[PDB]
Design a protein around this ligand. Structure first.
Ligand SMILES: COC(=O)CCN1CCc2ccccc2C1
Length: 150
């Protein structure tokens, strides 16, 4: 009864979260996950500012209203060599990573570790935050509010 959450640096408060090392988050779970980090799904404008501060990934994830990949450098295997906030247009499937936005983060790049899931609720799951440098923080709790996600 364990969930690993891989988290990135924040860029203008925006970060990427991947659950259990694979595309595995529904739209509803993504909102609940961001809420657990006292965050929200980013708007497109928030994501564009994050991009301008250095944010890029090679993974699809939810924002408010779309699934996107922020890209700074063109790479053939990431968003088909596009740059900018690449919007996923056509897909059969519903599960991705998520982006989240924390307004209380620093204004530019913050590559410090994340060491709390401050708004998790009581529950039986061992939830582990994993930072890119390997630092880990674990707590027992839950964050999913929709049964179809459990
Ligand atoms: C930046 O997001 C990506 O393109 C996927 C990279 N993942 C790769 C795995 C990983 C593990 C822990 C914390 C962060 C990350 C970042």
């Amino acid at each position: 009864n364990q969930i690993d959450l891989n988290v990135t640096c924040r860029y203008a408060g925006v970060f990427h979260v991947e659950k259990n090392g694979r595309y595995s988050i529904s739209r509803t779970e993504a909102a609940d996950l961001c809420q657990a980090f006292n965050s929200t799904l980013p708007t497109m404008d928030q994501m564009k500012l994050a991009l301008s501060k250095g944010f890029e990934t090679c993974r699809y994830g939810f924002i408010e209203g779309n699934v996107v990949i922020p890209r700074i450098h063109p790479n053939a295997i990431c968003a088909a060599n596009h740059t900018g906030v690449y919007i996923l247009v056509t897909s059969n499937t519903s599960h991705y990573d998520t982006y989240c936005f924390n307004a209380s983060a620093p204004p530019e790049e913050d590559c410090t570790s994340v060491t709390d899931l401050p708004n998790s609720f009581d529950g039986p799951v061992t939830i582990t935050i994993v930072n890119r440098d390997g630092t880990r923080y674990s707590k027992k709790g839950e964050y999913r509010t929709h049964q179809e996600d459990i």
